[PDB]
Structures are given as C-alpha cells and as structure tokens.
C-alpha cells in the first residue's frame, strides 16, 4: 500500500515541512483540523513518536517495512541512527530524488515503479530496491524522449547533488561512489528519538 492522501496535512501535524518547498505550509504551520491552534501537551512519548513519523513520510515507508529496517540497523556494528538513515538513503526512489531526476518524492516513486530504470542493465520496478556501492543506475531507452524525463534535463541545477552519487551528460546514468555516511544526509530530523521509540 501507499498513503495516497494530502501531503501538507502530515507536514502540519509533524510541524516540519517534509517536501521541498510549500506555500500551503508556512501559511499554517500548526497541526491540521479543527483543534489545530492549541498549545499542546508535549509528552516524551509524543517526541519519540512524531520523530519516527518524520522519516516514514519523508521516504514513503509503511510501518512494517520501516520496522524491518530498524531490525538490521540495531544489529549492524557502528551506531543505530547512522545505519537506519543509511539504508533509507540507499533505496532506489531516494537515489533518483538525490540525482535530480524528480521534483518530489512521490514522482520519484512512480518513475521507479513504472519501470523507467535499470541498474546493472537489469529492468527493475521495485521502489525499495537498495543500491550498493559501485551500482550504476541506468535508465530505459524507451524512457528517453519522454516528458517527465526530459523536463528534468534542464532542471539539473536548482537542487544540490550529494557527494556519494554522481550524474553525467546526455547519456543519463547515476554512479554510486560509496554508501552515504552521515554528513551528506539531508537533516530535517534527529536520529536518536527513533532508536528510543523502539525500546518502549
């Protein structure tokens, strides 16, 4: 399943603009609904819960899928917030967002879901495909000379590209240098209140 609902509504409740650029948000940054302008009780559980929601609606991950990402992140060496945001940053629909081929996250998900891409010459259509080190991310020859793929040819500049991946010229393809560590991760959220959420 997906969410398939209003997107500004879950940025107002979480008090954080999750998509890139929104004029509906910042006219009302307070939570939606009819009791929205309240000064609410900030529980310790509320600060851990709403921090976990900030990552599910940034990346578009259901709860059972997001929990399995936590299962291996707590189980790998290093930290837990480092490795949870790493394996969320390695999903294919997030890689397409960081490379500039899509304006938002939800249009990055369809272009992977509708099968407009390859990775190692292999046709893929799964949005939670996790890329690894040295993975080329190619693109279908049918998907060239298409409107959403050529409307993102001239808009290659307004968003920055992170250091761990790289885009090239008119043969559009994305090269993964290594897995992203921490510093080149975009931060709307802290990474310790998610770890403290699953200890309850």
């Amino acid at each position: 399943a997906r969410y398939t609902g209003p997107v500004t509504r879950k940025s107002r409740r979480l008090r954080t603009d999750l998509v890139g650029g929104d004029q509906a948000f910042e006219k009302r940054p307070y939570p939606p609904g009819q009791h929205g302008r309240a000064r609410i009780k900030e529980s310790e559980y509320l600060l851990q819960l709403q921090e976990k929601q900030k990552a599910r609606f940034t990346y578009g991950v259901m709860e059972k899928q997001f929990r399995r990402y936590y299962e291996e992140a707590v189980r790998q060496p290093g930290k837990t917030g480092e490795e949870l945001l790493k394996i969320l940053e390695s999903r294919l629909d997030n890689v397409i967002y960081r490379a500039g081929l899509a304006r938002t996250r939800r249009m990055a998900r369809q272009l992977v879901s509708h099968g407009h891409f390859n990775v190692n010459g292999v046709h893929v259509n799964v949005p939670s495909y996790r890329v690894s080190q040295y993975d080329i991310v190619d693109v279908r020859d049918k998907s060239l000379n298409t409107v959403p793929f050529q409307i993102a040819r001239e808009t290659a500049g307004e968003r920055p590209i992170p250091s761990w991946l790289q885009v090239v010229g008119e043969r559009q393809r994305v090269l993964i240098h290594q897995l992203p560590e921490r510093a080149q991760i975009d931060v709307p959220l802290t990474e310790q209140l998610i770890v403290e959420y699953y200890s309850k």
Binding site: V74, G78, T80, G81, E83, V195, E196, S199
Partner: protein
Amino acid sequence: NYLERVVAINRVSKVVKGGRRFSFTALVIVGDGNGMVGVGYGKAKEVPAAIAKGVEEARKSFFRVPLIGGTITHPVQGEAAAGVVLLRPASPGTGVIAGGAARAVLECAGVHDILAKSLGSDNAINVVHATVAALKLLQRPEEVAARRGLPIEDVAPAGMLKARRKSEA
C-alpha cells in the same frame, strides 16, 4: 538556556478545623546539558510558584557528573530511601534506555548512551534521589589513578582509553 524538566506535580493536603487546605509540590530537574545537573523540590500554593522554587533550588545544588564522551565510566547502583537505580554504560548507538524519572536526571546531565533500571519503589521523588546517589558513586579514570598512585594506562582498560582519544582528539 538550560535544560529543564518537571518530573511530578502532585497536590498535597492539610486538614484544619474548617476543611482541607491544598498545596502543590513540583519536583524539577535543571541541568547544564553538558556535565552538570541539579535537583530541587519546591512547594507553594500554586503550580507555577511551586515550579519556580524548584528551579531556584535546583540551580543552587549543581554537581559535576563524570563522562567519557557520551556515557558514564562504570556501572553503579544507587540507594535513596527505598529507590534502587542501576546505571550501566553503553555503546554510542544506544539512546537513553531509562524510566521516566531517571530519564530527566540523565538527559539534563548530558548523558547520551545509558542503560538504567529502577529496582526499588516507584516513587518519582525517590527514584530521582537514587539516580543522584548513583551519579556520586561514579569516579574518573584520572582520579582512580591518583587514588592508587599508578599511571592511568595500568588502572584503566585500553578499550576506554581510546574512547578518550576519539572524543576530542
């Protein structure tokens, strides 16, 4: 600028010839966020006046908490009246696994990697005093070498000495 958490606000009652006279107590934690924390009880006829006597009491009772760069140095077990709090260090990926009363004492003190378990009574006032009693039992690696007259390299394990090198370089 400091960190503050109110832990409990209960309403207490005194009996007179007329009836019952009510009052509020408000246990407050005030901390540096880095290495210092203070506990102050405070009580008054109204809740914001009971909080403000607690904040002014907690700031006149700071104490320094020995850290390594995210966690405490060795496991301790503290004893209040009948509250028993077991503190225990942890890896840097851990958060603060602690109950709601001992969470406020450790987050205000600047602790990031803790395992805590409260083993005695469930009173929030005595769990806070038992967490404070365990933080006094902590003692530094450079202070346990001056206490023994040895260097630090043979009183402390090498695995936590490198966590001093990594924490500030």
